[PDB]
Design a protein around this ligand. Structure first.
Ligand SMILES: Nc1ncnc2c1ncn2[C@@H]1O[C@H](CO)[C@@H](O)[C@H]1O
Ligand SMILES: Nc1ncnc2c1ncn2[C@@H]1O[C@H](CO)[C@@H](O)[C@H]1O
Ligand SMILES: CCOC(=O)c1ccc(N)c(N)c1
Ligand SMILES: [K+]
Ligand SMILES: [K+]
Lengths: 330, 330
């Protein structure tokens, strides 16, 4: 009997969300559909140009933990905020969803990370992230008893950007595996992959990462190929289990020579794609820690992903567990 | 020609929004559909029990100014925040809508006001407001040049709660009337009216308030009657122009013996009633300052109101001016 099903580790972020036209992206040299890192000066500049906005707790892994909790699984989260109002919001939202969150702020500066997310008419999201207090996450924030007591520890590729987070993750890897648990990562973003390609591959090939999440872009980038079939064969060879999403075309789960294809739910309208990948991981990891088939994990992933893209905000405001019961996924 | 069509004055507040069941209201002794004032200790308590939330810039008058700006009118706002992150959010959202907002924060403490708004399945909103830095708004925040140059200065009844706001308002009344402009107020909330009945009536009868906004509940409370026909006759006798909203039953505008009845627009679904009255006033005051007839002012009000209640958040995220152009109201 174990304390947690899923522990996630990520950049703790509050989203600042606004709708824009595509000319806004071009005028501001914002790479569309991507995570764009920005300094404090650029953050002020972009905000000055941003329309009236809504705020909502974010962070890829934070969203994923929240999604596991919503579904009914037992979640935990590691991520550093500042001792400020944005930090208080982040802390409230994740804890109120029923996720264990005990990471202590280190001070007020740097302030709590934020991401200005611009949503275009097509529902695509373009993120502009000032990492703030995220740069302070290190080994000192690893709650060893939590990693030891979690079926899966899952982390973002995004953590390779701040300086010392990777050290926390290696510490996590070691504790998890010594306790016979498994480690999971998402590739996060195609440019993030570009930046850390060798390191990500090393994590997979050394056995420090057991299950890998990727979308089509991330997979294509990982192997710098335009051949998706090549990407699928290579990713299968590089990790024990790979879950590869393909947006409206659904997902394929890979294990050794096994492939399991899952359909995407049919959408009324794409509101905002923010959190689709995160919530796919929520459903997959919930199913996975409940002992479900790799196909059923895929199904749960697509269900959670499908729900999150039909609302504003990265964390489902409706009941995932209820949705899963209605869908016969239970 | 003048710089401003509408100046509004109010409690500068950021909303913290969550959906709840009706048992939540009962267990926490929250008065349904009402503005519930709370201290710092109660705010912490309620937040600790609140679910994952979304933040959005609020304040009744704030929403109203932003709504006038959305429709194409020239707006200005007086309201006091603190020098903190919530205050920076408030300052951003109202300015980015093209509202003149120059009220200077006095420090970091008390912090920026916030209201925890719980939305029930029926779409009703129950607000729980800590006034924070709002208690510091006073005559010193009256930008005399703005009042002098605004066609209408509009204020909340809610302003009678903080200690010195009423002094700013009397200064606005004097300046507005001496420059040949009009003063407007909203009765805000039925319990607010209970609290300040004598003072509100005196504002109306002395000529400091020319145009009054009320919903059915507020009108009945103003005269402590369950006879709505009595309320309409009495309100028409106490102010020059009365705009009385009746939710799904639309509105009635009253001027002397004239009555102009307006229908509510067709609604897909009542998502969240937060801002309905605020945006009615936006539509009304936009028409009014554009020389439109009282009936067409009603119509523009009902349109702006009808749009706001079909979304989460108190400020329409879509173009009101475009909606009005499509609506044949121009
Ligand atoms: N650098 C980053 N690291 C982790 N998460 C991020 C980063 N930038 C944006 N996000 C989060 O990604 C989520 C969508 O997947 C958003 O909620 C946003 O907060
Ligand atoms: N005491 C108050 N004074 C002014 N506005 C308020 C108060 N409490 C809540 N509000 C605002 O009322 C709006 C809905 O009319 C919400 O956006 C909320 O911010
Ligand atoms: C409900 C939020 O309020 C506070 O935390 C708070 C209020 C007043 C103060 N002076 C301080 N320091 C904090
Ligand atoms: K979304
Ligand atoms: K609303």
């Amino acid at each position: 009997m174990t304390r947690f099903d899923v522990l996630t580790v990520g950049n703790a972020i509050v989203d600042i969300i606004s709708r824009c036209n595509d000319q806004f992206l071009i005028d501001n040299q914002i790479t569309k559909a991507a995570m764009n890192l920005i300094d404090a000066e650029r953050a002020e500049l972009l905000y000055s140009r941003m329309g009236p906005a809504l705020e909502a707790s974010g962070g890829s892994a934070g969203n994923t933990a929240a999604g596991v909790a919503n579904l009914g699984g037992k979640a935990a989260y590691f991520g550093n905020v500042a001792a400020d109002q944005l930090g208080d919001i982040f802390t409230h939202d994740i804890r109120a969803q029923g996720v264990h969150y005990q990471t202590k702020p280190k001070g007020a500066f740097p302030p709590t990370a934020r991401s200005m997310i611009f949503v275009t008419e097509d529902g695509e999201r373009s993120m502009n992230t000032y990492l703030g207090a995220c740069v302070e996450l290190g080994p000192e924030d690893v709650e060893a008893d939590v990693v030891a007591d979690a079926k899966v520890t899952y982390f973002e590729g995004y953590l390779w950007d701040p300086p010392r987070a990777k050290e926390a993750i290696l510490d996590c890897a070691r504790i998890a595996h010594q306790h016979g648990r498994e480690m999971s990562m998402t590739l996060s973003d195609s440019f993030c992959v570009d930046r850390y390609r060798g390191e990500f591959l090393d994590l997979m090939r050394s056995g420090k990462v057991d299950i890998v999440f990727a979308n089509r872009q991330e997979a294509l980038s990982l192997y710098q190929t335009d051949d998706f079939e090549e990407a699928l064969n290579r990713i299968a060879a590089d990790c024990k289990i790979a879950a590869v999403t393909m947006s409206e075309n659904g997902a394929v789960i890979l294990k050794g020579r096994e492939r399991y294809y899952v359909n995407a739910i049919r959408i009324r309208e794409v509101v905002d794609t923010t959190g689709a990948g995160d919530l796919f991981a929520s459903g997959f990891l919930y199913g996975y820690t409940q002992g479900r088939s790799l196909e059923d994990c895929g199904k749960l992933g697509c269900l959670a992903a499908g729900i999150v893209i039909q609302q504003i905000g990265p964390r489902p405001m409706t009941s995932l567990s209820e949705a899963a019961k209605q869908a016969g996924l239970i």
